Design a protein around this ligand. Structure first.
Ligand SMILES: CC(=O)N[C@H]1[C@H]([C@H](O)[C@H](O)CO)O[C@](O)(C(=O)O)C[C@@H]1O
Lengths: 670, 670, 670
């Protein structure tokens, strides 16, 4: 009886052949699939294969693809590890001047409670990521409302973001504002600075500077008197020229033509420009960002609270001069039902838009392209009701490369019921779509990594991510959970991130190679002590030392404390108390309440021999509310020594007489 | 002359063939051993092989096996990195509701000094581990005695642990107590809550709840008035039903049948139940834990201080109703000499027990099985005097899979002398034993990873671990050192963990695949800033901010300090001082002792123009122990202004006269 | 038409064959180059190859070699991650008693501003590295001058370092000092301690102890009365014997011959010996270290500020007895132009020296060997003007194995212009040179890893490293940057490390296998919470607890603060203030300045019912600079109650009368 070998044609049922191969080969052998796709009736032991793809219909009629290691040149990274509920990179990621930015929201729930719009960044092409930065504070009217953001990107050297205000109670949109800020840059320039004689302003030529009046500018080596150090923009002449006010003037014209100098700019030292757009009607969320040109950009949106749904974009044609001016452009009406959260990108005059489907039992994600920034469209529906996921994407060559994640295991397929309230391993997929062929009928979703959905609450932080390309690599930044319960049902219904393991949602990044890498590897194993967040150095005395300024806002318990000399050429140690008032007090002692007191001393020890003392006795002290003032001089300066009340308290007593009183006149008795 | 190729039959001496292969192949080629075992006279360059096992008799007559990479599908992880002496997972590990727990003891030595029973946990199937948690405090009678634990596990949703009290002086057992606590869970339930009219209690049906009166229970969406939020168990009706006291009552019966709601429970908000077992006679250590059924469990023990040794278990048949009731069951007398620290597990009605051997020159580790919870046994001796290691294990199919580690290099073999006081690379092994065949004569110990033994002291934290299975993976959690000396012989005889590199012992986990993995990989490279232990966020001002509450118990030196508004709707900044009393004092200045003082000020600056001041002058000040009180009013409220002593001190002086005294009557002179 | 396959002979142009292979093979296939070298006209997609080397002439006539993964058995690690400018391991690395030391300088720039000579260490053969330790403090005359070090190593159990003093203004050398300190060790010894009757000193025989009078020595189990615990060296008899002063004496001689005991020594508890060498004439930098024998060592140097350059070494023949005595030895004059920073090592009576070339357009790095410690030399010039890099190296068998790094991409080659002020990926290379053949004409520089040069400033921290061998592995410790701009041109011209991402330079280590590894792998994935720098434990109350002493020197903002009982058998909480004086004050309130005050209280709350209070009112308070003293007794001890000034202020007032005054005599009125 002849045996069949594995065909790897994606049609022949290769299950038997693969089973025999696995049974007959040592467990440590890496079975090479030669880049082929093997149809199977169940997924085999995938870990024993390299360079293999499986096609499997978990639900009959719905083939999906599954990658062994090395089939794709790619790798998953964990990029945040914070107790906040860290999720929703959707759809904010971007690359600027070699740095990859992964913005997200860190909250305590699916909502705006405790929420900061945040980012982490990578300065090494995704191998390592920075300490989280808060981009927004808690709203001034917290806890009624707080901020929210799902649209962010860069246009002409400025960060632009749709900063929404939403209620804590219902996550209801109350306000939309466009916030923008110059990105930090160093510029190494030749010429371009002029300063007319007998006046104090200098004109700086920097093409497409993206700065506004009041923005930070720093100068080095200008060779133009007074154009030096930290300055600010005084005027903007046009998109390529601005002026600064110098502190001085010269009798001759200055011009640094042919001379090399340095600028830069600063995100942190420049204010946000905030443009109030009010409550934009018929909007649930603003989501995703497509830079159009040197003047403006589009942001996606949907309305999904009331029938009928809208999905589309807002185009801001000139966000620099007119940040309040935008035009609403909807996708075709047939694609709007059961749709939300469109991802938009612009390539070579084509605006591409991909929707999120809201139901597994109705037509789902659809793709649209426009050559007139959303006025007219060509459209396609993905087969099998793609739902619950956004599909962020980039265009590489003729392909859109899109990523998505089911929110819990076995939810991807059409007709698949939601599967919440239990731990599972949701699948993350990518797919390619050739824009010339414009047909998604035969799309191949390839499962490249699995995440964890914790199951302690109905909500999932898995997925809902964002995509960027840098060089020859594509990056999908997205959420994933772990098995640590937030104890919402349990001892942490208040959702305090700092109890137990906080919230399991954190960010991941799938880094996938999309073109040739013509350099030797930059990869390293990280073996360092992470020393950015709380920088520690063992000092020459052998004691851990943190030289960075820090803020501890949570309740602190301290042991023995020494306040070191720090202030005014280190002449003094200093504690400053804020608020309307400060309070320094004494707890009720647990074991000896009869001793309750604080001793304040001008010297080193509890013995009054070491310095003048004032001792405030607690109410619980045997000598209740006593004060003892103990010094070798008691000198009352600048004011009379008075009783608080009139004719109620005395000087001295029968058993505490003053020897005498030294007076400049007889007592005034009345 | 014909040449022989490598046979890979474990009997032919393949040394020559492998040497020739290595000499004739590029160093970067991975030489595939095709899953075979190759006999060699010395270990070759193992790093150049994949999928290869070597058999080598370092000591003639004692073959051991050595795995190249990829021979086993497995990986070593480092899971703690703490300055404490972190060792002894033995034998406490368990899996509960998808989380892997690795309990251990963190001390400063082989003993109970500075010791906390601790754990770390993994919520991602062993890829990453949590910040250590202390499960015990220092004993109330520290430093005479402290806690110790080598037996811990879960029975009916409760953690049970044998918490021992031992002397610091000699590590002598003084007390045994069974401590237990409900495990934290979220339950998503339908129906089961009833509340009779005109009374305030509700009955909660939760099968096998494992709760006692006083334990924490939280309710959400109960649809039963008053059964809501954080509550406690009022009564326990039976193993499946308990009651809670609500704050109210209704005129009709309530019953949430068919309605979906949520409970949970809390380890942290429930107290330990502590059952004092006294000093159990003839016990040195309680070690290892086997859940038997829904009612109870067994714990291993040995007595090894005096002849004769005992080894066996204590069976607690009903730990819920009768935690103080247990029965002692010994292994057969012939297996008790030179034996300790049995590992026990229960599978399909069979209790398996494996001993630690104490001597390399006497019969060592033995294996035992019982179908009557230790009343009768079948037994086997491992060949070659296995010693110094516990052999934690799990049963997978027909095999016991056991792990062990020599404590320093070249100690494993029978007759091998101890090799301490020098750095080395001890071997960790695993083996399989088929329970049907019940013969260890041909057992194959496979060296899968090597650890470091530091050598600065005789003791070793290497090994003495614990084993669990989760899904298709087995996990061996165990100790390992590094080359950093604790300086016990040196400048740290006190064994302070926070000097230099502290103690080199830390925990590792070998994760080994034991069955098919039918999902795409979950593996990631960790690229995040670890931000759980000290959660830091760069605030909108660019300053590192820690929002978590924290306790700093070690001596602190601080620079410039600002106490921010924090308390009573943020109206005030607040410092509270604990103890019987607080002391705020002033060090003797190094450079200008003549200035020693503290200035207390109601305003922002050292100038008295900014606020009222009191200045306490030190004894070293030129104006020794002076006090200057400087305000625009001095108002003495609630009491007379008196001298401390009678007729000793005056009001004013010849050069410090008060202008007059305003009195309601003439001075009383006596 | 026949097609040619890849020849892999390093001469045939294999570009076409490799292109066809890549086009015809699945992207996930690892193409095995079989350890051969393939000539190409451009680098192909290197990531798709294993065990392959390419030879490529980026600049015609200058072949360089490029390694795919697995061609070399090696791996890159990141070993620091700190906000300081971390660079210049050159040339200080060493191995001592199983620990790998990577010393470097952490500053804020190419200069001595904010600089500490620092190290990180590995106790696991390079897998993980320690928290940075500061070896030097800021110079006493900072900010005029500060320390600097590029030469460090070990001779007879002592660390020796050339600690330079340089100006912040120009990095100009002002002073050279030899600093030395005993290395920490534990010794397990038999016999050697004698103590003569009727006197208090004991003689300790420890061969080559390397200790001086005053150095720390600790004793355990000596079996010699009074030789116990922490002690110090009283006298040094000779290189093998020293004495200690015990606290007691006995009537009989003591001698612990045949008895096992323990010493050790301590780097941290012993002072530096500092030998001032003054401003050594004709020196720019001292760099690199070669241990010669049991008595001394050589250090490299160059002079490069003025013509003519010098390059050579200083030999200290007896650094123990005569640390101030050294001899200057130059390399041959023809090799001194355009040369600096020599690396020196000593093997089997041969001193090897390799220079750094300073120009790509002039003859570059050269290699020299001497059998008389630099009096005579044999020399060789590396082809193609190797420049901008030091070439640290070790000798393994007949080969020198050297490492170097271009400082920015495409600078390595002869004639290549500097390429700064833009981000790039500089190449790191190694090469072997057979010392018997003594010809570098055909040297093969192999690119094994690429780093990042950030480009925000002209300077680069890439490279300038150090090399050590431990066992069968060689380690190159060196600098690398990331894409995070330091904002020198921008908002951080002051170069504060603790703003934003600080400085991008950090240390890396390339670990390369250089001989057989005859043990099973020690490798692990690091999955622990790093818990050495700021050791955190969740206490039994669920709160993060740090038990280590710590120093916070940066400005701190604190929220609610509790000072716990800590001092004098935990009777009191304690705050001590340093400096000439302490200041506790109150900020001007933002919202209610009219309330500005501090309430000091002997009790737990703001209500005076809880304890005695003194309230200091701010100048901004409605009751400006008021003081209210509120207690149930006001007792003035040890001194008269006086006004500060004479006959200016009163006791009481018309609306604040004291009831009376209790006096021992009539008022003295004048
Ligand atoms: C915060 C604060 O100022 N507390 C003060 C209170 C309030 O002024 C009072 O309760 C009205 O609210 O009264 C005093 O107790 C008092 O009269 O003895 C002292 C105390 O310092």
């Amino acid at each position: 009886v002849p045996r069949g070998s594995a065909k790897g044609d994606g049609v022949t049922d290769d299950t038997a052949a693969l089973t025999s191969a696995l049974n007959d080969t040592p467990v440590g052998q890496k079975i090479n699939g030669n880049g082929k796709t093997y149809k199977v009736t169940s997924l085999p032991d995938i870990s024993r294969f390299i360079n293999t793809r499986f096609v499997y219909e978990r639900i009959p009629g719905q083939p999906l693809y599954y990658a062994s290691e090395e089939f794709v040149q790619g790798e998953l990274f964990k990029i945040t590890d914070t107790p906040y509920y860290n999720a929703w990179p959707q759809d904010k990621a971007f690359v600027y001047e070699n740095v990859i930015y992964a913005p997200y929201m860190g909250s305590d729930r699916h909502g705006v409670s405790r929420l900061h719009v945040s980012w982490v960044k990578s300065g090494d092409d995704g191998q390592t990521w920075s300490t989280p930065e808060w981009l927004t504070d808690l709203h001034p009217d917290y806890p009624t409302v707080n901020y929210h953001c799902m649209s962010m990107g860069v246009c002409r050297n400025r960060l632009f973001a749709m900063i929404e205000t939403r209620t804590l109670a219902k996550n209801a949109l109350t306000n939309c504002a466009l916030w923008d800020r110059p990105m930090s840059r160093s510029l190494h320039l030749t010429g371009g600075i002029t300063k007319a004689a007998n006046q104090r302003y200098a004109t700086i030529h920097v093409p497409d500077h993206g700065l506004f009046v009041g923005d930070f500018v720093n100068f080095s080596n200008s060779a133009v008197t007074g154009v030096s150090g930290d300055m600010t923009v005084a005027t903007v002449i046009d998109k390529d020229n601005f002026t600064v006010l110098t502190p001085n003037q010269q009798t001759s014209d200055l011009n640094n033509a042919g001379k090399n100098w340095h600028m830069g700019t600063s995100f942190h030292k420049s204010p946000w420009r905030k443009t109030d757009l009010g409550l934009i009607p018929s909007v649930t969320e603003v989501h995703s960002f497509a830079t159009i040109d040197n003047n403006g950009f589009a942001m996606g949106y949907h309305q999904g609270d009331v029938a009928p749904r809208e999905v589309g974009l807002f185009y801001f044609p000139d966000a620099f001069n007119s940040p309040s001016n935008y035009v609403r452009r909807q996708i075709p009406s047939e694609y709007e039902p059961d749709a939300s959260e469109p991802c938009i990108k612009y390539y070579d005059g084509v605006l591409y838009l991909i929707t999120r489907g809201t139901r597994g039992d109705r037509l789902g994600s659809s793709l649209h392209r426009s050559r007139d920034i959303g006025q007219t469209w060509e459209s396609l529906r993905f087969p099998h009701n793609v739902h619950h996921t956004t599909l962020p994407f980039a265009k590489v060559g003729d392909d859109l490369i899109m990523f998505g994640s089911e929110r819990a295991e076995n939810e991807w397929e059409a007709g698949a019921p939601d599967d919440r309230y239990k731990a599972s391993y949701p699948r993350t997929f990518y797919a390619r779509l050739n824009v010339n062929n414009w047909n998604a009928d035969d799309i191949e979703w390839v499962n490249i990594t699995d995440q964890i959905y914790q199951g302690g609450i109905v909500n999932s932080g898995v997925g809902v991510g964002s995509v960027v390309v840098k060089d020859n690599y594509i990056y999908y930044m997205f959420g994933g959970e772990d098995h640590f319960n937030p104890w919402t049902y349990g001892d942490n219904s208040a959702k305090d991130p700092f109890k137990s393991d906080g919230h399991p949602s954190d960010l991941y990044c799938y880094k996938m190679k999309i073109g040739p890498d013509n350099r030797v590897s930059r990869d390293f194993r990280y073996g360092a002590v992470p020393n950015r967040a709380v920088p520690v150095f063992f000092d020459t005395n052998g004691v851990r030392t943190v030289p960075a300024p820090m803020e501890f806002t949570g309740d602190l318990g301290l042991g023995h404390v020494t306040i070191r000399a720090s202030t005014s050429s280190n002449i003094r140690s200093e504690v400053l108390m804020e608020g309307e008032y400060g309070f320094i007090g004494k707890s009720i002692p647990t074991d000896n309440p009869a001793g309750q007191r604080i001793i304040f001393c001008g010297g080193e020890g509890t013995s009054s021999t070491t310095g003048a003392q004032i001792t405030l006795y607690g109410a619980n002290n045997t000598d209740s509310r006593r004060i003892v003032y103990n010094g070798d001089e008691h000198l009352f300066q600048s004011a009379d020594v008075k009783p608080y009340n009139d004719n109620v308290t005395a000087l001295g007593g029968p058993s505490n007489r003053f020897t005498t009183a030294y007076l400049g006149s007889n007592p005034i008795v009345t």
